[PDB]
Write a protein that binds this ligand. Structure first.
Ligand SMILES: [Cl-]
Ligand SMILES: [Cl-]
Ligand SMILES: [Cl-]
Ligand SMILES: [Cl-]
Ligand SMILES: [Mg+2]
Lengths: 498, 492, 498, 496
């Protein structure tokens, strides 16, 4: 029973990772799935495509490595947060697509919450902001959309889950309907202080309590997946955390004030705040994180909706880059953006603005602007967003970072890391293993079954592959950023409300 | 011999053209010759007056040679040209004292800022019809006088001559015997009073321009002189020649010329309409070549925006023209592209605007952006048309169109739809040449008038608004929202 | 549970695929997974057998997960595969002793030169159906035994096993219990006697291949074994059909009677005609191979493959950059009424059937000053059709059968210009069916027959729909005139390379 | 007025050009104007004579307008031109009875088969210096007469005139007063005896060409007449363009050779006052001696050089004005095994195969547009090597340097590859319009603008030198592959 598997069910792909007791990566597999847009500003996934791709990557990562099922000591599950699925208990059939965290469809529902004066309650009790980001209003949308569904839900016929929950339920043939505190905290239906569902929110959004999973700590045996057969060895699912929380954990940011920024589909900066919730006065989120020994901690979070996804757009939709010839290649073919800024509000703006009516915009164009400039600006936007959240986080926490601890695939991009260093005037420390999300999920799972004894067993794993140090002075820094803010302001409030 | 043809010379911004027409105004022969655009620094635009002349004389010879027409056969020559572009030369030697400073040149921005700051916006609009912008010739003559040590005294002395391109051609053609312009050209200089139909003393003073350097100003249809001997008997600025060639000779008749930029003019009969909506008030030609007035607005980046796509975004070409892609999608998925690359002209006149793209989401693709870039041509045209309808209280039923881009059926239908207006595409596309020919021809009796020409003119296609037109105000609203965000981008 | 589905596994050259079909042979669900093409040196082509395995396994899990089908609802699995591609592994450990050597690999060119030189062309043709070329498996197995010191003695000792991709998959799928191939796949090895239907003693001798390494050879329709994809205590699903991909496509097109032919358009073209129960020896540069009759019994076929078809359009797009996408081909080609006298012979990797000239190289003819880009695009499309005629003239010449119709499949069949011109240049009707998944259908039919899911093919054939029929639109004179120039062109592309 | 300038008109295959130069032979002003290449079917090549006239008159007007030079300041005009290209027109009206049939056109292949069948090879080479090929004017004149019912009878009535382009231009510029040609142009017609220096009645009889349509043949440097462009300006120099280039390169003594890269490329060597017979597939033709008197040359004629680039740009769109052939070609270090045999219009010297058509070989999956561009450029150098070796064979001279032109086709990349493939230095004078210069010299001499070539000889031109950058083994490998490719493009087109 020699390995731990992390299932990392992402916004744009499903991945599976096999790790050994030394905590080295032995095998990895990834499968993409379709991003569905039924209209502009909407974002959907097919839950059966989420399941299929995640189940199949698990099969593939063992097959390719010639690992048999019975050698797996435990599974850890980590996932794209907020994304919302509602299905039939009896058949497993979804009643609607997954509504992705990114989708803006519930803006109008959000306006109602705000009009009803719920801002303070929601922040005080859930740590969250009123925005289409969070699951609660998505659940409402689906129930309002599917005639009869509310009554069925009362009848107990319909289940809600975030993606962790959908996955476990499918992996356990429906025996387990569960979530962890970190995922639950993103739903806007869960009280992050009492550590239970919040009845006022359920009342407000008219969501039957019967739909809801049990909520548990992120390091604990939740159940059995019969991937060694129904007659085989027991393979327990024993770690769950929302992906950004799992990255925080795998970065060993388990002490108050410790922070990381993950570069994925989006960008997400979290700082652990120990056992105490810190209120944001600067447009951030208060959320649940994982303590040293898997207990409930709190974090501050800045969520940026588009980072890597903007590069994917360049590739897949604008076809301005490809595999052979990536973004860093083109970007560095030019010395600046020639005045161009790109505000990547493809799905509205997240922290610290929270404007679901913002839409993607490009500024500063002249006749001598080419593709490389636009490319380069799209990349710089990742760094500019980060500064936005970093500054807000410093204000809320009282803490100035002397170094930015980063992870995610995009960190492989030297141009981006250096520009990030530059625009912040802070060093950036890049690690040798970049997919820290999966590692976090592994550690949680592993700790739960005693594969590891403690986390400090894992202290010496990470290697700072590179340190980036600022190559520009305050004046330039500050000038470039000022223009960013000019761009952002012009992108805001684009979409006409319902 | 028997004089069976009229010749139009159209000296343009990037090429010199010569066109030959018969009494039925059939296009018999056409020649086009490119010439160098000089950019000595960013935003600066110059021409070599000797290359303008050589390419204009050469195309005249070429167009006749190829058609086997001789001089004895030519009733008259009409002259039409890129306006505002400014030349200062030596009366004695015919030598320029500096390049032509092209209408596109932005070198006089500071002088313009000071004029406006000194409170002169109304005086200038009122008396010249113009906006205080580096577009127009006055500031460019000043610049040259200021640049060339000693010239202002030589100008006073009578040693130096000013001309727009019409004046320069005609002077060269008459070997210096005729120093003349028409009203339409003069109206573009910012030195001419459009009401008194004479040079404006106050402008000459504030810009410090000696009166002895200026040509005589005459009708657009009058025999001005001769060239080895053919009568030269028509002159109009190019956009005014196009308006004429479109036979827009009655109040309320309008055209749009699609090119690198768009130039829309509407005839306002014999009365000058003062703009309060960001347009130009200018001189035009009435039915018999007499002074009429017009409202005008130019969109500086139209065709140019597609060229950006071609060459810089490199998203398109000859194989793959914009219409190909545009039509791969049934809309822009909420995208608007404001190609304010050089700022915004009429009706905004914001030099600080820069180009921008709006409404992006995850599923937006290159085709939506290509489409939206084409659409912008139609939106910017709407901007001008709304202004013109506002200034004039004339709501158009139909717009006459010309230029290359009129061939683009997608664009013309979208244009009709976004306007709610018929768009009339003519059979005979050489409207600038026709305008100049008609002028020249009237002047010499080739035609007694324009009635039969009117009668026989054919519209090759009329676009009318489809049901998509009912969305035009929703769409347009999004556009105006985009323009507002592209404005005032550039830091002073 | 009611076994309502058949699954086809279609392990291809560049991807592994899994397809689910119901009793009406509706396509219920498809999955496809790419795997790495290994090019160790120019001309050399490898696959990792563990990647083939992992991707094929994973897609079968994926296709059923997405469709919500469980293993107990599968009546049978049918297997089809990229032919000739060769694997040698250790029986004991399941470990390959070397990468798969793909059909496309040219490494054995010198072995083949020596076979020819040693006079064996007729013996090889008469007994195996095959041409002496690196294409086929036998020399590949020799290369591996030669390369891997000691391997032939272990082979003798029954320690090493040979398989084509069918054989590898089924051995993996049966946990090593079943080492089998079908007649179609075996016929491609150059070690199998197509007349005695046993491994050929002389071939095994000449190539010094131990008979102990070779699988048992069986019908293309017959239960071979059982796989379990659930694990211990799971369902055992019958594996009950096997054909080489091109044969499966033949079968799928229901070309089960003498005279019936199909062409599959892809990167290459693969053309086969059924010759019933009797083998036709080629005098005209074709292959004689084993195929499947109406009840999955041994029939024979003539075959010829055009190696560059679709690939030539890929060249126009990627290398010449004359189009943005392949799909635009027909659009450009049709902007002109003809090619202005141009022919394009895309012999980029030599010429396959009917020529078999590895030394040919691509060439373009008939250029004059007024020849433009669309003339060249149009000619490059036309080449596909011309190369097709080369093979079909040979096949008529070999068989004496002038085709009633040609059934077509593959992406390019969507190209009506191409399909019409194909009809035209052949003087033969082209039949485009409503089905596209003809390889997988073929493998499905064979599996289904074996387990009695279908009693026979009678109603599949009854219910079979031709979606488009192209009829020739030029006379004999013209088609013959045009062809003669094509022929003149090919002759000058030949024997180019030193 | 002081007559301080000479103008030369260089009416080429692709464009008409005018150049105005001073007494030091410095170019004051140049203009070039393209015109349509008309292909009524593959293999055929035509020009509109009225477009030739128009673009040539316009450029003349343009150079002077530009430079501000009046007619009374010009001592003389010299005329040079694309050779062989044939025009027949109506004397009374100036109307052509058919397009110009360009030298390139292959339409008269069948007429040439008959000449060949008739055993005329030797007669034609002995008397005209030429090869039986559609290249030359005579068969093109036959074709036009044959084509236009009643034309022969009109011609005998004096109603129809024949001219090469020199003749057409001078006729047009003199309003029909002068119908003339020079020895060099006439030599290219296959109707003119290069030894007796008069029309050849056997060739006229055999092609059934009425003597009445022919112009007068004169010295290449002599006052022919004058044109009002106003003062009448002396027209006083005419040479075929490649002979004018030879003259402008100052190749006026025996053994002096050059290669001019244009639409096509053309290697000529002056052989003084003696005609040398080619045994190696070249032409014997008329050239100009130091005072513009009759000399002889050997000539290698390559049909497609610059034109192959035009094809790339204009028809294939593989290159553009902004990014040129040298730009792309240099993006790759070789052609990845590709050869382009640019027989777009048949093969010239030394092969003389009017049935060849353009062909590309050696294609593999990794061959890209850059390899093909480059290979197109290389073909220009390979064809040059073909003619150079023949020329060495015919002349008995081993060249130690190739003297080339300074025009637009003779780019750095090509010049370096030329050197490499030859194993000889290439010398490129920084002279842009060497053809026009030749024509200018001729005209100037005629009017005494210059007294002789002496002081022109002493003008130190900048000259660039390229040295061989590869070794024999490679050179010879590369060239062998070329020959392999040529063979396979030969004999492509089915005969009529
Ligand atoms: Cl369980
Ligand atoms: Cl006068
Ligand atoms: Cl079994
Ligand atoms: Cl004369
Ligand atoms: Mg076990």
């Amino acid at each position: 029973k020699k390995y731990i598997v992390a299932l990392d069910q992402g916004t744009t792909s499903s991945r599976a990772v096999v790790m050994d007791h030394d905590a080295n990566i032995i095998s990895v597999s990834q499968r993409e799935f379709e991003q569905i847009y039924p209209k502009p500003g909407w974002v959907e996934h097919d839950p059966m495509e989420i399941w299929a791709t995640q189940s199949s990557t698990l099969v593939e990562v063992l097959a390719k490595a010639d690992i048999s099922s019975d050698q797996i000591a435990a599974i850890g599950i980590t996932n794209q947060r907020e994304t919302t699925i509602v299905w039939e208990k009896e058949t497993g059939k979804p009643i609607y697509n997954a509504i992705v965290w990114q989708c803006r469809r519930t803006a109008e529902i959000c306006e109602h919450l705000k009009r009803d004066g719920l801002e303070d309650y929601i922040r005080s009790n859930t740590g969250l902001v009123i925005d289409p980001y969070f699951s609660g209003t998505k659940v409402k949308w689906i129930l309002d959309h599917v005639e009869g569904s509310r009554e069925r839900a009362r009848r107990g016929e319909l289940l809600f889950g975030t993606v962790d929950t959908w996955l476990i339920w499918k992996m356990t043939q429906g025996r387990v309907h569960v979530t962890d505190y970190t995922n639950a905290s993103r739903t806007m239906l869960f009280n992050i202080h009492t550590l239970d569902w919040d009845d006022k929110m359920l009342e407000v959004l008219d969501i039957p309590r019967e739909m809801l999973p049990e909520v548990r700590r992120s390091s604990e045996v939740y159940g059995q997946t019969n991937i060694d057969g129904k007659g085989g060895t027991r393979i327990p699912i024993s770690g769950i955390a929302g992906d950004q929380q799992a990255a925080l954990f795998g970065q060993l940011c388990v002490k108050e004030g410790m922070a990381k920024n993950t570069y994925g589909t989006g960008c997400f900066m979290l700082m652990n705040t120990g056992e105490k919730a810190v209120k944001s006065e600067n447009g951030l989120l208060t959320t649940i994180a994982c303590g040293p020994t898997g207990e409930v901690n709190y974090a501050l979070e800045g969520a940026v909706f588009m980072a890597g996804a903007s590069i994917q757009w360049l590739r897949d939709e604008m076809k301005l880059i490809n595999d052979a010839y990536d973004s860093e290649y083109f970007a560095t073919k030019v010395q600046n953006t020639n005045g161009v800024y790109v505000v990547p509000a493809f799905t509205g703006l997240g922290a610290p603005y929270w404007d679901p009516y913002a839409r993607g915009a490009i500024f500063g164009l002249t006749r001598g602007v080419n593709a490389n400039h636009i490319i380069r600006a799209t990349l710089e936007s990742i760094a500019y967003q980060t500064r936005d959240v970093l500054e807000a986080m410093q204000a809320d926490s009282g803490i100035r970072l002397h170094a930015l601890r980063v992870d995610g695939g995009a960190v492989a991009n030297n141009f981006l890391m250096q520009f990030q260093s530059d625009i912040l005037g802070t060093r950036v420390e890049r690690p040798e293993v970049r997919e820290v999300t999966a590692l976090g999920a592994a550690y949680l799972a592993g700790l739960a079954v005693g594969f590891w004894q403690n986390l400090d067993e894992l202290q010496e794993k990470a290697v700072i592959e590179r340190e980036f140090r600022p190559g520009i002075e305050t004046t330039e820094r500050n000038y470039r950023y000022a223009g960013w803010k000019k761009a952002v302001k012009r992108a805001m409030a684009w979409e006409e409300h319902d």
